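2024-03-11 09:14:02 INFO receiving multi-entity request
2024-03-11 09:14:02 INFO entity count = 15
2024-03-11 09:14:03 INFO echoing inputs for audit
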Amino acid sequence: ELSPSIDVHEGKDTVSVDVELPGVKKEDVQVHYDSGKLTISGEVVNERKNESTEGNQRWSERRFGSFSRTITIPAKIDADRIEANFSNGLLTVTLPKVEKSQTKKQIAIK
Amino acid sequence: PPTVNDLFSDFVSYSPRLNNQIPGELSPSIDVHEGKDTVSVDVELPGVKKEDVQVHYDSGKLTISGEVVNERKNESTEGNQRWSERRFGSFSRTITIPAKIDADRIEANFSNGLLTVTLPKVEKSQTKKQIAIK
Amino acid sequence: MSLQPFFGFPPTVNDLFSDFVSYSPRLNNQIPGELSPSIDVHEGKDTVSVDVELPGVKKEDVQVHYDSGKLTISGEVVNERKNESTEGNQRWSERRFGSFSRTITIPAKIDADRIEANFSNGLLTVTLPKVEKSQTKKQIAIK
Amino acid sequence: NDLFSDFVSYSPRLNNQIPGELSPSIDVHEGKDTVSVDVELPGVKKEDVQVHYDSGKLTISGEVVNERKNESTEGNQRWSERRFGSFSRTITIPAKIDADRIEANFSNGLLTVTLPKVEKSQTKKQIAIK
Amino acid sequence: NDLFSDFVSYSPRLNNQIPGELSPSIDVHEGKDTVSVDVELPGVKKEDVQVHYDSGKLTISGEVVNERKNESTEGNQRWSERRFGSFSRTITIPAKIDADRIEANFSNGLLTVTLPKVEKSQTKKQIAIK
Amino acid sequence: ELSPSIDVHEGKDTVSVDVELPGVKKEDVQVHYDSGKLTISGEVVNERKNESTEGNQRWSERRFGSFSRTITIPAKIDADRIEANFSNGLLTVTLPKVEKSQTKKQIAIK
Amino acid sequence: NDLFSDFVSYSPRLNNQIPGELSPSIDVHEGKDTVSVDVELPGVKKEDVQVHYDSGKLTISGEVVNERKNESTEGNQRWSERRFGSFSRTITIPAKIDADRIEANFSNGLLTVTLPKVEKSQTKKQIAIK
Amino acid sequence: MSLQPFFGFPPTVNDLFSDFVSYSPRLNNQIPGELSPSIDVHEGKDTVSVDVELPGVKKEDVQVHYDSGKLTISGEVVNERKNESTEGNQRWSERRFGSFSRTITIPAKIDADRIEANFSNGLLTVTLPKVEKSQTKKQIAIK
Amino acid sequence: PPTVNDLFSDFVSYSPRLNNQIPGELSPSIDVHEGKDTVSVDVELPGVKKEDVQVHYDSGKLTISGEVVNERKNESTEGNQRWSERRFGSFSRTITIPAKIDADRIEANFSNGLLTVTLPKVEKSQTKKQIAIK
Amino acid sequence: PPTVNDLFSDFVSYSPRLNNQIPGELSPSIDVHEGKDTVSVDVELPGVKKEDVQVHYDSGKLTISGEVVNERKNESTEGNQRWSERRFGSFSRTITIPAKIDADRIEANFSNGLLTVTLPKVEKSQTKKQIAIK
Amino acid sequence: MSLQPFFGFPPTVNDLFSDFVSYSPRLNNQIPGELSPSIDVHEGKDTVSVDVELPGVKKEDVQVHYDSGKLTISGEVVNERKNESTEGNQRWSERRFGSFSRTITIPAKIDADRIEANFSNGLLTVTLPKVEKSQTKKQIAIK
Amino acid sequence: NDLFSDFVSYSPRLNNQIPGELSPSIDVHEGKDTVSVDVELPGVKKEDVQVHYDSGKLTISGEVVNERKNESTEGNQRWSERRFGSFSRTITIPAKIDADRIEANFSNGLLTVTLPKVEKSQTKKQIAIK
Amino acid sequence: ELSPSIDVHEGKDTVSVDVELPGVKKEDVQVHYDSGKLTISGEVVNERKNESTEGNQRWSERRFGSFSRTITIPAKIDADRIEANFSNGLLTVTLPKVEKSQTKKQIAIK
Amino acid sequence: PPTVNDLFSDFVSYSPRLNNQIPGELSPSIDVHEGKDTVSVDVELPGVKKEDVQVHYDSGKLTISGEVVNERKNESTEGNQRWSERRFGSFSRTITIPAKIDADRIEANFSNGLLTVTLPKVEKSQTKKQIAIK
Amino acid sequence: MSLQPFFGFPPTVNDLFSDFVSYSPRLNNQIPGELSPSIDVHEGKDTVSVDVELPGVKKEDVQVHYDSGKLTISGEVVNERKNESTEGNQRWSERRFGSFSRTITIPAKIDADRIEANFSNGLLTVTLPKVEKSQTKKQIAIK
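2024-03-11 09:21:47 INFO inference complete, emitting structure
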């Protein structure tokens, strides 16, 4: 019952996925890519579960537990160049597009 | 009443994954219609100037974004808010258009705080059928 | 807890009740079957401004009136795509349509004839100037 | 009828009661054609009570006087149940009424304020929208 | 222990939250000798967060930035669950603590503020009574 | 803010769609089929909105208003033989499958 | 009008709802001369619904059937929003009514029960006091 | 706390609401300006007895009637010492005088014509016999 | 609404000393009137047999006591109390008569659950005066 | 916490269309996993006999249905429910399998009130890749 | 309203409080961090049965104990697919895993040594036989 | 400590008070090693009070007697604040205790029941699961 | 804010006053008689106020503090034979009447 | 907690006649003691100047009266009351002295907001007796 | 009703909670067994004054201290007539005696060393000067 927040963006050559994982060890999270499915899974651990002793928990605003979340990628990816980078509790997965393809247009409003 | 922020997404199936809910946050209301020749996207943006809102079409995805600004925020004092029901702040919403569209012919109009985006379909013919109810 | 409205009231709390009983939509003339537009109420020591959100509403379709300390904004939100939806064209609908009415009791003395309203970009701003001395006071001789 | 209106109108402390002012008892009977407010005011002279009507808000004010207040009579108090000093109370009138037809009546320490209703507000002000 | 103290201390809106500012999630664990406040701050640089301590009130502030905000990338958004912009939160600390011994630690988007307790307030100020 | 309840079933030759529309006139509901999209729309009318008079409404458990609901049909349909039937407030749309195709299997549980 | 009467009457669980029975939606409009109860019952045959009236208590009962229940069709379900099985609901009628003049109407899955009012109870029974 | 009436109701609680909504004086036809006599309600699996306290009330001044599941006991409590009090004779007064009415909704099927009432020593006992099978049931043919 | 149990007492002045309140306990209601020739004490005792209530006059003090008995208490089971507003149990109340009385001529009557005690005064003459209100 | 009754549906996109919610109704909990060679569907069915539950596979759709029966319902009286948290009644849930499957090799097992359905994929090879986190 | 628990309590209501205070999960030994299994409690005039839902729980992983009027069912729900989820295999998850504990205070006199428990098809049924006369009563001599 | 346990235990009417029985006042002090229940019982003889302990439930019972009840003394009552008749009260003990080590003390109308705690229940009964 | 319960009875030769004083030491209560005024005063002590330690107070139903209560005796008393007796938390003061005087009458009810 | 405004009154016996209660109004707290030689009346008057309070003795009745004035009332604005527990306004309280007193020798002292009135009794001798408790 | 603290909070209400949580006696360090003196709190834009009622309290018996935004006034109210009451001299008692403590959390930045207190006629007035810019602010370097 813990869902990490996720953003998804798409550029010319790139599809990037942001996952919010504060207090999560790099070792604890797994990134997988299968046939257009990108799965980010893992577990966020309570580092106070190490004890019930020596004074206790006054306030719980934090969610802890196992999480798995799947993004479908409609575009075709080169899976060998896929990169994952974990910084400041933010996990960013970069998926290179096999085909750099037709880009945006800004629409002016009358 | 939770609201899906990005419509008809190919990326993520809306479920009880991350709520994003926290009900009452700014979510400009969106109506979408598909006719024979056209896709219409209506977005409610009361109290917004058209130069503050941008519309971008990319590869079948219409993104409407901008900033709803409190104008009484012009100082930290001098008269108070007695009541606030209005929702301010940034917004970005993406709709995945359920049809193939001619991007050169897309138009946007802003009237009475309502933004309407017209997206003519590349295939203009009649597939549709009304079924008589016995 | 809720005993704070029991013992001697700080004038502030007596204001809190004024704000509640004034601006809360459920406490003024609820239809209920109509739509209630979102509003922001601001008060300087001079005027009081009300900002009402009316996206997709034509200026001809909104009316603002004032009667004895109560401001009412009413009108209609028409669904222009109604027939399209009737033709099976609807894909996504977040929009609510119908007649709207919003009444708020204003907790200040204002000059009624100086009330003016400006409608732009789906936002209706009503401005009620406050006067210190009531010009309507009217003492009544007792029999 | 989904009615909190009587409460916002009549209830004493929604109308901003002023500490230091006594709050008189009140009965409100609305007719088909009118609305009557009976106010209990024992021991106050007719010249000590003012009735004002503004913006839909009826305000009864004045001073309940202890005639025995003076210095000649001091240790003379034996039993005291009575409250003296200033009194002010405001009540909101829900009905549409005629502000010029409003009159008051003081009999046996009971003050009756009878407010004539109208079918249509003479007071309704339509606004620009520019 | 008849304890609303945790509530007045920790609860977000008793501490006067400022509209326009995001409210981060917080875990508070008080020890025998100390009190630790764990704050979740994913995606914010260490230089974007300030920790102030005043009069028993801990205040964490800053800006969560969307690095994709710029004009080059616009129609690139696909799915958005993330909240950006400014954040400020204040929490009252019930315990007697050492204000000079207070330090902060930022690891994996988790900011730990560890406040050392004292047996006796160095801060207690006895007053005149003249 | 009114959503009529909908069931969907799929047989060998047939896909059937049930819609709950109590108190709805046959004339008030429209059925459309476009490229695999079946849309059921219309409006349920309050027949007491004909009056506020002669005694009033004590209890509201009923939803009234415009409704539109779309079912995607993955199978290919012969659109000319599509039939709609309205009985006892239940609207049933029958969509004949172009291809009668591979059917079920019951799995026994060990 | 100090009225909880509509609540005791109409509210589902004051009337003792039976677990295992579905509770249909209801609109109640009382006229000057009558009281009408509109009940939503889509997908149920006219012979599957019974309307009983006893001691001031109206009871609508029956069975919503899934016609697709059988064994021939099993793995055929795709999307299910619909509730089936037995349904029973009782509602108390505040008004004085004519028990013999009570009739029902089933149209478009909407069942209208129209109960004629009386000025004077034919049902009022005066008691001994011995 | 009050969430116990939220999740699946034990039939017992559904009874608790029946008792409340049946016998509570505030929830049935309150005047309010009249007097509400104290009552005890007892139910065996066979009958149901109601004991109403009416001290100083003449038998001619009490009436009991039954209409469609609702039992009503009404009447008057006269102050015989009224003129004495008017003459300045009153010393201590705990007694309340006026008209009384008490209506309770009975949550059982009874035989109305077998209802009988006995009034003795200021206590009025009404007895309503319960029948298992309702004799008033009346199925209604649907058009 | 606290009730003083012993009326016009010479022994104890009712004040906020011991409450005895615990509102809702059995307190048969008492009216007392004093006329020119007589003192009347009316006590409400619904559902009480006259043989269950005793009245004693001692030296200017009228004591009325007895037992209000629940008759449905005839077993610990067999049908239940669905509702109880009635107050049972023991009661004793003392009134100090505000006049001198002839004890031989005191009478008590029990009718309709109302007990009335009549106490003729030894001094039967007219002291009383009505004052005309100007 | 609303629950989507039919998983991964091609027919209907879950949104705020018909709620079906009425939280607390019977919804046997479902976990779904997809490995290299297999699709596993776990359904919680406490207090259910295996002969009361049926599993049907049709054209990529796994339907699990049955009846959760209260066994204390054996009479309308004789001892009462003091408490009920258990949810009884009928259930039918459909999962659209996110892979192509060999239907002849599908198996179902019922143990400790947990039903597990195993669905071997027709394509058994390794597409999957773990991405190292920098 | 909530005043029904104010005036003289029908014994029934005093029971309603007994049921609440007995069986409500929030009112007995909440962890809170653990899982609370759904239960049905039934009482005949002879025994009392508790039905606890434990799908996916091995018989070796459940324990039932009784101490001084309080029945406790505890254990663990293991996620066997945990490593699969760790490998990125998870598609849909409604299931909750962890340690579970459920304590209920039983409002009856039972024979502790005759308590027996049967676990089948994910349902654990505990049976506590009631005895009229308490065999544990133990009068205490007063000094 | 999230503690309603004291309430369920000690509160009078959760323990099923019996109408017709008086409810004595009680102070409960739990120690590290024990739990003490002080009960106020003025005017009752030591032989008129019984203390029972069962299944974790302490029950104090008996009769407060009016010695002046008799017929010889009748009109002798002047002022009455005192309550007489039967009294019964039950209280649940949260702590693990030794049932055989339980004793009572009556001094100055104050009855002290002191219940020794145990670290481990001698009473804990593990159950089959077959 | 503690008032001990008090009963007052009057016999032929005797006026008796009962005071409820559970947990009160005999030494802690004073009985005085002045010109027809009988005053019972004193203090009831918390014997757990001896500590805040070693485990604390879970439940307070008991009143503690100073109490003084005065009964006016209309009859004339021989003050030398006045007796006070403290038993089982019940304090009983016996005041002998100087004049044994006119006694009761039982009234029969018609 | 209702408070009787005039102590030991010969005029009116406090009962549930006119409440006067409206709990929370200004009632300066009063303690009264009677010793062998003296009657002491202590009245709490915090924040009151002695010149604002008057004491009058008439025929066995001590009347203490005056005005408790809010001093922050010095304007209708300029800073606000955030909290008020203090009770202001007029007060007059009468005590009927339960002994005969020498009026020439009565004294009043005002210290720390506590007014103490000393009333020496005309009869100074020892009637009082302590009763030994057996 | 109580939903007014649900939707977007007017800053005013957020103040109402500040006042409640600051000055309410039950919400700060209640003994409970001690006495809580009546107080008036006033705030100008410059200072904040607290008026505490302590009749019959010697100046030597009152103490005022300030620690980290919390002002505490404590002391003792001695009953000088205690022995008189012990001698049976008491007639009427409205006065409450014992130790008193009152703690309020002050919702403003003040200069602690400029806090001064004046005790006269049983009224203790504490004066806390407010400074706009906190001199205690103390930014903390993050590791």
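2024-03-11 09:21:48 INFO post-check: The radius of gyration of chain O is 19 Å.
2024-03-11 09:21:48 INFO post-check: The helical segments of chain O are 11-23, 82-86.
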